[PDB]
Design an enzyme around this catalytic site. Structure first.
Site, PDB file in Angstrom:
ATOM      1  N   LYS A  34     -14.332   1.978  -4.111  1.00  0.00           N
ATOM      2  CA  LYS A  34     -15.065   2.738  -2.177  1.00  0.00           C
ATOM      3  C   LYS A  34     -16.208   3.208  -3.239  1.00  0.00           C
ATOM      4  O   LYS A  34     -17.433   3.006  -3.414  1.00  0.00           O
ATOM      5  CB  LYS A  34     -14.564   3.902  -1.449  1.00  0.00           C
ATOM      6  CG  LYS A  34     -15.563   4.257  -0.532  1.00  0.00           C
ATOM      7  CD  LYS A  34     -14.639   4.532   0.829  1.00  0.00           C
ATOM      8  CE  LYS A  34     -15.116   5.460   1.476  1.00  0.00           C
ATOM      9  NZ  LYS A  34     -14.655   6.376   2.901  1.00  0.00           N
ATOM     10  N   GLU A  73       0.549  -1.259  -0.106  1.00  0.00           N
ATOM     11  CA  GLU A  73       0.099  -0.020  -0.120  1.00  0.00           C
ATOM     12  C   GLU A  73       1.163   1.347   0.240  1.00  0.00           C
ATOM     13  O   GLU A  73       0.339   2.996  -0.184  1.00  0.00           O
ATOM     14  CB  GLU A  73      -1.214   0.117   1.189  1.00  0.00           C
ATOM     15  CG  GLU A  73      -1.792   0.933   0.545  1.00  0.00           C
ATOM     16  CD  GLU A  73      -3.059   1.371   2.078  1.00  0.00           C
ATOM     17  OE1 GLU A  73      -4.373   0.940   1.982  1.00  0.00           O
ATOM     18  OE2 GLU A  73      -2.986   1.447   3.117  1.00  0.00           O
TER      19      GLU A  73
END
Ligand SMILES: [Ca+2]
Ligand SMILES: [Ca+2]
Ligand SMILES: [Ca+2]
Ligand SMILES: [Ca+2]
Ligand SMILES: [Ca+2]
Ligand SMILES: [Ca+2]
Ligand SMILES: [Cl-]
Ligand SMILES: [Cl-]
Ligand SMILES: [Cl-]
Ligand SMILES: [Cl-]
Ligand SMILES: [Cl-]
Ligand SMILES: [Cl-]
Ligand SMILES: [Cl-]
Ligand SMILES: [Cl-]
Ligand SMILES: [Cl-]
Ligand SMILES: [Cl-]
Ligand SMILES: [Cl-]
Ligand SMILES: [Cl-]
Ligand SMILES: [Cl-]
Ligand SMILES: [Cl-]
Ligand code: NA
Lengths: 551, 551
Positions: free
Chosen positions: B516, B357
């Site tokens: 998202k 990440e």
């Protein structure tokens, strides 16, 4: 031999794929979908009533698929499939058949090895396990103090651990009252922590080892036997608390196990394809024989599909070919397996062995070194856990990572709106990966949001999703023993197809020998505190530092 | 700004590495060791008294190292290090400092954010956690029926879950009487199975979410709250069974938590670097505050090493540079982390987030798309497990996979000769990977085994190990809170160094936004049975198949 040894790089189809990659490597998913409203319909397959395999979000077009199917034909894949199923000794380096398919052959059609049907032997072990499991689960099998068994501890490594653990975890909703434990590491922590949670009077150990001489497993088994005897005293009692998944009757009897509780398997059962055999006894004990048979039946349905379906609608073949496109043309080193299902938390780990130990090879079937890529690295975590860990890199990194997203439509846990939330992510992630969000789109949004040219220049680049990250989506009605069997067998056959096309041997594992040999040499050198000088400077340095840390 | 934005590919050092790779590609480890008996001594480093980092089994020589250190200097790494530690807002896209190092700054030297020292606030949260944990662990804190707490359930995703779970698993030998559980998946199975194992009267839940609006975490928290209230009845009782790791006091109070039990952290603490903050409360509850302070102290030790040590003896810099050599010159897409320690079973998973990440990025600090590789794929399983699953591919596949082998010299469990067996494998595997086994050696072994000439000729190529598979070996005296802190911080800094040199932003995560957004759009569409046509044909097809399956 029906199994041929065609070098894929010498085929017309491979040359066509090379040309196609050069001229179409920038293929874009947004354009592919925009230009054909029937893309999903054309690039998806249904298996039975309960599974949909959508391969439409892949960087493939009609030309790619044409050349890929041509490659399967040109390497004589059909002949290889036939050879495996009929019992030909396709594991040539060890001169063995490869017959995990016979283990789940519910049809009972004969499967011949050296002119003799192996089904009666397969079925005799299955029948023996069913009967034994009923006594254990039902309470009739008593421990040395007369109590029913409450805990089962499977002791095994690799193929004798990964499958049974993964399947029992995946099928928790189907479990009975027994608590099943899996010990595999030789690290003493593994057995130590397990033994703290169980009672000698009510625990049954399964020692899973064909030779019954596997070092890690036998070390663990002897530690368990010592612990058991501290409580029981008389070795005669070992027979009520230990069973063997093995063929070494002499060693099994010497350990104290009644050979009536030795469950056999065969040379044509590879460890990494063994959960369907006696090795699956821990699965039978955890979920019952009815459910184990459902698992076998699901694998059998997929076996029938694999043998009987033309390549263009053959799921394992399609998945294998798409994988080859990425591995050998796009140069992707890995494949991620991402089940949106917490119970399937060990599914990817299982395929690390099944896939990587099968196809992590560099010498072709003719004994010549390969000049092309073979098996990829398999990895992954279940969604949404993996999603919140490493998807940043899948979306915005510099590596191409084909992903298989897997999910059930119906959860076993009917709690609030959790499943709709989980599924919204399953669908959205593949949509995001495929299509992304362009710089023009991001800029137009920042402009509408009142942002300045300076803010836009500073932030737009970092908010762009280039997309074209390919995925397969496998949607199952519900994860049941049968659908899990379907899925495991599907990947087994995908692995088989890739190994056929890559002209390698998928069923041996000579790459494990060197480490074992070198460990055998080092082991006695670790007993005392004396300096070691018998290896290279690093090995010596590490061993000597270990000795100094210890004392 | 002290953080510079130097494109690595146009540096003289990178050009020198490219020229060096022309000959350095076919380097041979056997030869490198044979050419210098001091190789281990020259390519290893001791950290304190309890850690040895051996980087000698890497495909590097003196010239490789000289060019790699030149690259670190040419990209002005030293300035970047100072920038991070002093609180410069190096996370430029979000305009934030990056100060996980301040969380473990045991020396209490001031660290200024907005002209004020943050150390008093850091220390105040630590003191608040110490006091709270003593009440919970010692039994003074009573549940709604007057009983001491026996179970703690942490609810969080990503950084709010992975670190605390990994550390509590790694440090099981240091645990107190409490049983800790970690729930993260929005899949309802995760919370459902956890709740079946705990009692409302004796369970404390920690809701870990900075915003206190995280969809997955709050869905889980509300499910737990509903379950708790089904037993407790009165909402007033929530305050005795729920605490928050958050800064949203309004939402925390609305949930029913007493804000005295809200533990705060700051914007300069990234989630994937947050276990050292209030997010670590579950660690403190599991192993006690004193052990948590040892964990912090170990990280602090490593921080001091990183800031004060010249690059040539700086462990995180050395590891980072060797990683760049493989990622950017040898073209390896992945790195395996292989701890020979069952307790460390979640260590590789933790670094999937921490590494991937952070460095899975494709736009450089100047807003320009990179033209080189950034972060690798991190994966692995503990030895000897992984060893019996996928090492076949590491030894005999077609992918270069640098591996970090990690092990303690002393086990926390005294179990016969298990640890010597485990360690024999740890040492042997890296020896095997580096040096392999030639055709001459295999032929000799087969001849002694009585194989015929034809049998030998047919089998020899499959048994050859080419070697030249590079590894680092990290040997620690014992995995303790302090040495674990050392190790985690070491890798954090390795990641930082790589991001500096690659000219990317390691501390943002814009790549999480699209998924998202798209999931928010899909969620309401999953509520009814109506056909969906609002997306591309694949997304529509999958959603519609989902609706049919649940009918
Ligand atoms: Ca063409
Ligand atoms: Ca590549
Ligand atoms: Ca030179
Ligand atoms: Ca655990
Ligand atoms: Ca309220
Ligand atoms: Ca590569
Ligand atoms: Cl064919
Ligand atoms: Cl055979
Ligand atoms: Cl059968
Ligand atoms: Cl046999
Ligand atoms: Cl049952
Ligand atoms: Cl290739
Ligand atoms: Cl040497
Ligand atoms: Cl050399
Ligand atoms: Cl800040
Ligand atoms: Cl606070
Ligand atoms: Cl404590
Ligand atoms: Cl590069
Ligand atoms: Cl020892
Ligand atoms: Cl001969
Ligand atoms: Na044989």
């Amino acid at each position: 031999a029906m199994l041929k040894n065609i070098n894929p790089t010498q085929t017309q189809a491979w040359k066509a794929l090379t040309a196609h990659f050069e001229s179409a490597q920038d293929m874009d998913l947004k354009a592919l979908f925009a230009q054909d409203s029937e893309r999903f319909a054309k690039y998806s397959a249904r298996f039975g009533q309960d599974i949909l395999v959508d391969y439409s979000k892949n960087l493939v077009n009609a030309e790619t698929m044409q050349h890929l199917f041509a490659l399967a034909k040109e390497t004589d894949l059909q002949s290889a499939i036939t050879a495996m199923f009929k019992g030909e000794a396709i594991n040539q380096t060890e001169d063995r058949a490869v017959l995990h398919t016979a283990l789940r052959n519910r049809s009972n059609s004969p499967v011949l090895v050296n002119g003799e049907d192996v089904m009666p032997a397969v079925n005799a072990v299955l029948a023996k396990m069913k009967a034994f499991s009923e006594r254990v689960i039902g309470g009739e099998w008593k421990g040395f103090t007369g109590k029913a068994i409450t805990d089962v501890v499977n002791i095994g490594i690799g193929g004798s651990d990964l499958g049974p653990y993964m399947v029992t975890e995946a099928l928790v909703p189907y479990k009975n009252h027994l608590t099943v434990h899996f010990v595999s590491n030789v690290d003493g922590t593994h057995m130590a922590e397990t033994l703290k949670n169980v009672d000698p009077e009510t625990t049954l150990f399964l020692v899973a080892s064909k030779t019954f001489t596997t070092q890690e497993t036998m070390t663990n088994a002897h530690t368990a036997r010592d612990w058991f005897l501290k409580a029981a005293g008389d070795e005669a009692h070992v027979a009520k608390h230990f069973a063997a998944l093995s063929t070494n009757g002499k060693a099994v009897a010497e350990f104290g196990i009644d050979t009536d509780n030795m469950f056999e398997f065969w040379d044509w059962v590879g460890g990494r394809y063994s959960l369907w055999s006696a090795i699956g006894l821990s699965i039978i004990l955890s979920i019952g024989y009815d459910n184990f048979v459902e698992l076998l039946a699901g694998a059998h349905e997929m076996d029938q599909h694999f043998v009987n379906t033309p390549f263009e609608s053959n799921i394992p073949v399609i998945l294998a070919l798409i994988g080859i496109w990425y591995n050998n043309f796009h140069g992707a080193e890995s494949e991620a397996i991402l089940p949106y299902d917490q119970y399937l938390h060990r599914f990817a780990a299982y395929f690390q062995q099944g896939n990587m130990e099968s196809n992590g090879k560099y010498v072709d079937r003719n004994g010549n070194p390969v000049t092309y890529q073979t098996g990829p690295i398999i990895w992954g975590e279940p969604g949404t856990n993996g999603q919140h860990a490493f998807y940043q890199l899948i979306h915005q990194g510099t590596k191409l990572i084909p992903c298989d997203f897997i999910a059930p439509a119906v959860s076993h846990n009917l709690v609030g709106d959790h499943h709709q939330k989980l599924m919204s992510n399953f669908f959205a992630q593949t949509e995001a990966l495929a299509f992304g969000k362009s710089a023009q789109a991001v800029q137009a949004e920042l402009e509408k949001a009142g942002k300045s040219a300076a803010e836009i220049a500073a932030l737009v680049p970092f908010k762009v999703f280039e997309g074209n990250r390919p995925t397969n989506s496998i949607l199952v009605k519900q994860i049941t023993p049968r659908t899990l069997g379907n899925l495991i067998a599907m990947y087994e056959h995908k692995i088989f197809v890739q190994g056929v096309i890559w002209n390698i041997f998928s069923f041996d594992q000579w790459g494990v020998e060197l480490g074992k040999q070198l460990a055998n040499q080092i082991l006695p050198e670790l007993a005392d505190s004396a300096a070691v000088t018998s290896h290279d400077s690093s090995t010596n340095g590490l061993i000597n530092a270990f000795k100094a840390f210890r004392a």
